[PDB]
């Protein structure tokens, strides 16, 4: 019993963390066999922020320039080239700790775990969701860009950090350097824009309150998609659609709860509120378990 | 800028995780050095259960009874002793991963990660503390006996729990390293039950800090308190007491942000009276409990958001 916001265990991705310097600047990279991933802004100077051509900056750059280190070994770089917004550095040495791994880019609604470092050093491990707004609500502070967010399936990276918006909410890339978002590494006005609430991921958890015995706002009605989708519209909830539904069904079939029974207690937590009541000790809709991460957990995947 | 609930990195605890096995029982063990840790229950049937004696269990037992299994590797077992509730299995291979560690017990309100492991294997880590009734509200199903709690400070482990069993409540219970329960809880199938529960002040007033620190003040108000009058109103709400001690303990988020602890106190006195009028704290829309004044030097910036 009992429900947790938890992370993936982070001992494969450590071994992976390394400091990158360029000039004045230093932040985390990712050493992955010979080659070290960080965010390509680590080239730029303050003033070169404003309006940089990244192409002429890097031709201005040469392997001397980065300084990489791993622990107390300074690593030689022998190589540079960006992909999109990621900065590669070839290496003269393999990470001998180099997990099984995949880069995958991930949709809003699901979760990932981030190691959140410092000098290349790991500091903390939390769980996050990239938003419908494709932000995450992440938990950095200045010299945390490059730190990566990551799922274990092999090591499955997602995400690798480059800034803070003026909310207070991240914004980052794939580790195939593309942006999360409407969002550019250059500085100029970038604001989140207006985030919704990720449907299926609440119904994922009333699926993990059942299943830890908080039942109380079930009730004897069903919906429609349709009715329910007018419903989520108005409070600024994702349209479920049937794929959530399907892949809500592993759920559904432990619990004996169809979908569309639990879419009329959610819209009826909506309409109502929870009448000063909470759920797994939350006075908020929570939306940041998957379907995936609600199973995960309430069968000891390891 | 942000605030989680965020654990430390399980990398040196997940180098240390095997299974062990007893007879029909398999669960998880703590192995550094050459010595497994474990709870001693592991030796018992459900039958023995209800009025075991410990003693007279093990004296039947050879080293060659109990199986260790390390990855895809077996460990021959070669002595073994029980301190307190945990067994101790020396075996013939010291981990060559052990890290910098230490065993400390700590004090209710303390935090720790816990490292959830089935059959040796990790599943996940999430941040707890100790209650005042001396359970822990983790996230355990059958099979997680043996996983461990820990701080990683200063790149030393400090091991603070081991998990042995989950109370009706639905809410855990377990040893320090040196087998010692936390609370009156009895490794034997008795009556005994998490008593009544009570938030940790301390730790709510340090959020509240946080809060501060990130850059919102809507709850702070103009009056201050005494101490005694704190405590008074606190008890009422169930909060534990506040001490001198962590008055003390709170003075570096109070040098940082302005706000003397007894005027933070005057703020929580507040938001119990009021509530949170629609708004939330750091995301929350109930008063957090489980970070502590370190915990919160540690994630946020030393720079108040002004
Ligand atoms: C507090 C915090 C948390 N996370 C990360 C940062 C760093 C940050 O937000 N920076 C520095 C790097 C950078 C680079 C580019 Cl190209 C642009 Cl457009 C913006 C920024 C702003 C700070
Ligand atoms: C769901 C769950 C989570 N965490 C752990 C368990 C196991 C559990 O609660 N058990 C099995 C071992 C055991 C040993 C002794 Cl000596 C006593 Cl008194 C009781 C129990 C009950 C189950
Ligand atoms: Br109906
Ligand atoms: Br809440
Ligand atoms: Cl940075
Ligand atoms: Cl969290
Ligand atoms: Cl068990
Ligand atoms: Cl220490
Ligand atoms: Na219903």
């Given at each position: 019993s009992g429900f947790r916001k938890m992370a993936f265990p982070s001992g494969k991705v450590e071994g992976c963390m390394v400091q990158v310097t360029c000039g004045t600047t230093t932040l985390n990279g990712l050493w992955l066999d010979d080659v070290v991933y960080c965010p390509?802004?680590?080239?730029?100077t303050s003033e070169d922020?404003?309006?940089?051509?990244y192409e002429d900056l890097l031709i201005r750059k040469?392997?001397?320039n980065f300084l990489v280190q791993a622990g107390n070994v300074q690593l030689r770089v022998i190589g540079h080239s960006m992909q999109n917004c990621v900065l590669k550095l070839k290496v003269?040495?393999?990470?001998?700790?180099?997990?099984?791994y995949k880069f995958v880019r991930i949709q809003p609604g699901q979760t990932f775990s981030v190691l959140a470092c410092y000098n290349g050093s790991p500091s903390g491990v939390y769980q996050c969701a990239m938003r419908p707004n494709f932000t995450i609500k992440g938990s950095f502070l200045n010299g945390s860009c490059g730190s990566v967010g990551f799922n274990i399936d092999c090591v499955s990276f997602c995400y690798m950090h480059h800034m803070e918006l003026p909310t207070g909410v991240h914004a980052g890339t794939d580790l195939e350097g593309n942006?999360?978002?409407?969002?550019?590494?250059?500085?100029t006005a970038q604001a989140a824009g207006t985030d919704t609430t990720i449907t299926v991921n609440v119904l994922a958890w009333l699926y993990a309150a059942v299943i830890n015995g908080?039942?109380?706002?079930?009730?004897?009605f069903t919906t429609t998609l349709n009715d329910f989708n007018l419903v989520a519209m108005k409070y600024n909830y994702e349209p479920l659609t049937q794929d959530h539904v399907d892949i809500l069904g592993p759920l559904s079939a432990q619990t004996g709860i169809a979908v569309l029974d639990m879419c009329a207690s959610l819209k009826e937590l909506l309409q109502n509120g929870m009448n000063g009541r909470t759920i797994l000790g939350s006075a908020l809709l929570e939306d940041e378990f998957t379907p995936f991460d609600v199973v995960r957990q309430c069968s000891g995947v390891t």
């Open positions: 390509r802004h680590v080239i730029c922020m404003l309006n940089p051509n040469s392997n001397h003269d040495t393999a990470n001998p700790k180099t997990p099984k942006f999360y978002g409407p969002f550019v590494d250059r500085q908080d039942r109380w706002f079930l009730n004897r």
